[PDB]
Design a protein around this ligand. Structure first.
Ligand SMILES: Nc1nc2c(ncn2[C@@H]2O[C@H](COP(=O)(O)OP(=O)(O)NP(=O)(O)O)[C@@H](O)[C@H]2O)c(=O)[nH]1
Ligand SMILES: Nc1nc2c(ncn2[C@@H]2O[C@H](COP(=O)(O)OP(=O)(O)NP(=O)(O)O)[C@@H](O)[C@H]2O)c(=O)[nH]1
Ligand SMILES: [Mg+2]
Length: 414
């Protein structure tokens, strides 16, 4: 048998709209990540999608077919049980250009990524470029490029695009990134991709001694109709542990917390609760480490967590000291041009009184620029952000021609 363990690594799946990200995650895991009504009706990813799978290898078989996602080697002609390697998970991003902020929130959770490129579309499409640039900025450099939909192009066409992809990465941080051709729809060469994931997206070192921090991307009311009181539960908060670890029965807090009134002014009150349960996928555990998206059960009124209310928050231990800032100072750099537009225009300098969009951890916040210098801006935010470490990465977007566009990045200075 294979052990039941949490996933130990998060692999992002990014790329231009409809290039096959969600279908690729389904080919690997058997799971369709889209769970929302609007997603099913529109046939698109809107919220971050999630799926897990075990990975093993049949030691008597040849590679790549030796790599499997279930405890059988019958497919490669062996009655032996495959050796368990690890459990992995996928963060499935939306490709829609209007949803770049959601992609950015997901990239904060990624240990590595797959950039999906459709073989039957011109290269490089706007969000092929934009998601690529985003990965570089955020530092998700453990990248595999997947050439998808090879089932609907000729070998000559696939090879032509392959050369253009290598020339695109030439002279960049991604110069040595592998390109793996697949058909996600027809599950062709998926075993080669699994081998690639093992080779190029290793599980990173973790620091379990660091103060526990979870970035929140989901929150739920888990109570269903037709249930007895015996099985009813408090609110559930979902996200990624980025350092340390959490345990059942630990006192925790949600930051910045709840928007309330205090002294005639808007304030955020830290939400204190206790961990009632820990789940990854369909399995319960007593503790949670980095890797995977964890569901933290709490004793909170489920009305506090319903419908992703706490998206963008962080969770820490109750006694942790974490800055919660209404005003932030950013040591920044600007991109040369707007890479996500159909026509890439020059990026204008930041000006005082501009409204910018700031991506910090899983959070997305608008703010007004109150100060500009050569290397530094100060921003007054509409909602405070939890800043759990010094020099956390932020991504800066500007509204250009009616769309939020990534224009730069920086370090939040505390
Ligand atoms: N021929 C072919 N079609 C594919 C392949 N992979 C995906 N498609 C098709 O491409 C369409 C989009 O697939 P989807 O996985 O939803 O793409 P996406 O990149 O997740 N879209 P979004 O950016 O909106 O999340 C679907 O009709 C799907 O069946 C493939 O390998 N071959
Ligand atoms: N810690 C913990 N997580 C749970 C518990 N029950 C469900 N979850 C997690 O919460 C998420 C949603 O649960 P699920 O029952 O699948 O769907 P749901 O509760 O109907 N959510 P929604 O109403 O948003 O559809 C999943 O990630 C699941 O693993 C629980 O008792 N404890
Ligand atoms: Mg999708």
């Amino acid at each position: 048998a294979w052990p039941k363990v949490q996933p130990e690594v998060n692999i992002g799946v990014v790329g231009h709209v409809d290039h096959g990200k969600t279908t690729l995650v389904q080919a690997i895991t058997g799971i369709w990540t889209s769970k929302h009504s609007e997603e099913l009706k529109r046939g698109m990813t809107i919220k971050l999608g999630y799926a897990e799978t075990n990975i093993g290898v049949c030691e008597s078989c040849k590679k790549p077919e030796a790599y499997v996602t279930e405890p059988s080697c019958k497919s490669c002609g062996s009655d032996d049980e495959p050796k368990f390697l690890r459990r992995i998970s996928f963060i499935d991003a939306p490709g829609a250009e209007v949803l770049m902020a959601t992609m950015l929130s997901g990239a904060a959770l990624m240990d590595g990524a797959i950039l999906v490129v459709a073989a039957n579309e011109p290269f490089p499409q706007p969000q092929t470029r934009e998601h690529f640039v985003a990965l570089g900025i955020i530092g998700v450099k453990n990248l595999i490029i997947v050439q998808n939909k090879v089932d609907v192009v000729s070998k000559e066409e696939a090879l032509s695009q392959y050369r253009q992809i290598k020339q695109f990465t030439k002279g960049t941080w991604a110069e040595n990134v592998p390109i793996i051709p697949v058909s996600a729809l027809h599950k062709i060469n998926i075993d080669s991709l699994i081998e690639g994931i093992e080779e190029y997206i290793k599980t990173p070192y973790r620091d379990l001694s660091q103060k526990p921090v979870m970035l929140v991307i989901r929150s739920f009311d888990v109570n269903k109709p037709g249930t007895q009181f015996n099985e009813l539960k408090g609110g559930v908060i979902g996200g990624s542990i980025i350092q340390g670890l959490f345990k059942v029965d630990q006192e925790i807090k949600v930051l910045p917390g709840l928007r309330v009134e205090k002294q005639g002014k808007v304030s955020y009150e830290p939400i204190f609760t206790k961990i009632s349960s820990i789940r990854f996928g369909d399995e319960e555990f007593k503790e949670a480490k980095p890797g995977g998206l964890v569901a933290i059960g709490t004793y909170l009124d489920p009305s506090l967590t319903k419908a992703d209310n706490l998206l963008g928050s962080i969770i820490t231990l109750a006694d942790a000291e974490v800055p919660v800032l209404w005003n932030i100072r950013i040591k920044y750099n600007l991109l040369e041009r707007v890479v996500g537009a159909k026509e890439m225009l020059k990026v204008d300098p930041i000006r005082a009184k501009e409204t910018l969009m700031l991506s910090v951890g899983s959070s997305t916040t608008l703010g007004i620029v109150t100060s500009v210098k050569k290397d530094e801006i100060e921003v007054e935010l509409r909602r405070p952000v939890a800043v759990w470490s010094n020099n956390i990465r932020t991504v800066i977007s500007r509204q250009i021609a009616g769309r939020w566009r990534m224009i730069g990045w920086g370090l939040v200075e505390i």
